[PDB]
Amino acid sequence: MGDGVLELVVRGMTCASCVHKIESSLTKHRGILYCSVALATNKAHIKYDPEIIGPRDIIHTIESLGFEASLVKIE
Ligand SMILES: [Cu+]
């Protein structure tokens, strides 16, 4: 079994000070099991909990900082 694994692209992550802030901020959600962001890929390997959280929420958070995102893994 496994949680809602959703390695979406996250952009605007201009430095480590973005990356760890995004990480730490997202990890505030109980509706996640993991987040592993990287500005190399421009991504967020979140595992988002699908009872509490939808991708929209993570996006809202990302936006509510100063960042943007897109699910590369559509299909
Ligand atoms: Cu930054």
Swiss-Prot record:
Residues 4-70 form the HMA domain. Widely expressed including in heart, brain, lung, muscle, kidney, pancreas, and to a lesser extent placenta. Expressed in fibroblasts, aortic smooth muscle cells, aortic endothelial cells and umbilical vein endothelial cells (at protein level). Changing residue 68 to V: In MNK; loss of protein expression. It is found in: Golgi apparatus, trans-Golgi network membrane; Cell membrane; Melanosome membrane; Early endosome membrane. Cu(+) 6 binds at residues 15, 18. It comes from the Eukaryota. ATP-driven copper (Cu(+)) ion pump that plays an important role in intracellular copper ion homeostasis. Within a catalytic cycle, acquires Cu(+) ion from donor protein on the cytoplasmic side of the membrane and delivers it to acceptor protein on the lumenal side. The transfer of Cu(+) ion across the membrane is coupled to ATP hydrolysis and is associated with a transient phosphorylation that shifts the pump conformation from inward-facing to outward-facing state. It is linked to Menkes disease: An X-linked recessive disorder of copper metabolism characterized by generalized copper deficiency. MNKD results in progressive neurodegeneration and connective-tissue disturbances: focal cerebral and cerebellar degeneration, early growth retardation, peculiar hair, hypopigmentation, cutis laxa, vascular complications and death in early childhood. The clinical features result from the dysfunction of several copper-dependent enzymes. A mild form of the disease has been described, in which cerebellar ataxia and moderate developmental delay predominate. Occipital horn syndrome: An X-linked recessive disorder of copper metabolism. Common features are unusual facial appearance, skeletal abnormalities, chronic diarrhea and genitourinary defects. The skeletal abnormalities include occipital horns, short, broad clavicles, deformed radii, ulnae and humeri, narrowing of the rib cage, undercalcified long bones with thin cortical walls and coxa valga. Monomer. Interacts with PDZD11. Interacts with ATOX1 and COMMD1. Interacts with TYRP1. Directly interacts with SOD3; this interaction is copper-dependent and is required for SOD3 activity. Belongs to the cation transport ATPase (P-type) (TC 3.A.3) family. Type IB subfamily. The nucleotide-binding domain consists of a twisted six-stranded antiparallel beta-sheet flanked by two pairs of alpha-helices, forming a hydrophobic pocket that interacts with the adenine ring of ATP. The heavy-metal-associated domain (HMA) coordinates a Cu(+) ion via the cysteine residues within the CXXC motif. The transfer of Cu(+) ion from ATOX1 to ATP7A involves the formation of a three-coordinate Cu(+)-bridged heterodimer where the metal is shared between the two metal binding sites of ATOX1 and ATP7A. The Cu(+) ion appears to switch between two coordination modes, forming two links with one protein and one with the other. Cisplatin, a chemotherapeutic drug, can bind the CXXC motif and hinder the release of Cu(+) ion. This is Copper-transporting ATPase 1. It comes from Homo sapiens (Human). The chain holds residues 562 to 633 of 1500 of the full protein.
